Amino acid sequence: DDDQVAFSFILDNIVTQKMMAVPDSWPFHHPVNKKFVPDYYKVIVNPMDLETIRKNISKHKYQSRESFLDDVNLILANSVKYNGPESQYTKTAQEIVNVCYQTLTEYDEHLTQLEKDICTAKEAALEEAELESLD
Ligand SMILES: CSc1nc(N2CCOC[C@H]2C)cc(C2(S(=N)(N)=O)CC2)n1
Incomplete structure (x- = not known):
C-alpha cells in the first residue's frame, strides 16, 4: 500500500539515477524505433x-x-x-545490470522489509475481497 509506493520510488531512482547514468547507456533508455532499426522487432520478440x-x-x-x-x-x-555476447552494446547492458544489482544490495535491508509488508498487505486485501464477495 503505502509500502508499494516507497518500493516503486526506490526502484525508479535506481533506474534514473544509477542505471541510466551508466556511460553510453542511450541505446537502452527507450524502446527501439522501427523506423530507425527496421530489423529489430523481427529478431527481438x-x-x-x-x-x-x-x-x-x-x-x-x-x-x-x-x-x-x-x-x-x-x-x-x-x-x-x-x-x-561480445559486443560493446552488450558490455554496456551488462554494466547496467551490475549497477542495478549493486544498488539493490546497498538497500537490501530496507527493500526486504518493504517486500514483506507489501506481500502481507496484498494478502490482507485479497483475503478481505474474497470474504466480502461471499458475505
Ligand atoms: C543504432 S541506433 C539505436 N540503437 C538502439 N539499440 C538497441 C540496443 O541494441 C543495439 C541497438 C539496436 C536503440 C536506439 C534507440 S531508438 N528509439 N533510435 O530507435 C533509443 C532506443 N537506437
Whole structure:
C-alpha cells in the first residue's frame, strides 16, 4: 500500500539515477524505433528498455525485486541476441545490470522489509475481497 509506493520510488531512482547514468547507456533508455532499426522487432520478440521499466514501476507492476530483475535481465538477454555476447552494446547492458544489482544490495535491508509488508498487505486485501464477495 503505502509500502508499494516507497518500493516503486526506490526502484525508479535506481533506474534514473544509477542505471541510466551508466556511460553510453542511450541505446537502452527507450524502446527501439522501427523506423530507425527496421530489423529489430523481427529478431527481438520480447522487447524491453529502461523507459518501459519506469512505466511498469509507476503502474506498480513490481511487488518484489524478482519481477523487476526479470525485466532488467531481459534488456541484457536482448542485447546478447541482437548485438552478440561480445559486443560493446552488450558490455554496456551488462554494466547496467551490475549497477542495478549493486544498488539493490546497498538497500537490501530496507527493500526486504518493504517486500514483506507489501506481500502481507496484498494478502490482507485479497483475503478481505474474497470474504466480502461471499458475505
Ligand atoms: C543504432 S541506433 C539505436 N540503437 C538502439 N539499440 C538497441 C540496443 O541494441 C543495439 C541497438 C539496436 C536503440 C536506439 C534507440 S531508438 N528509439 N533510435 O530507435 C533509443 C532506443 N537506437
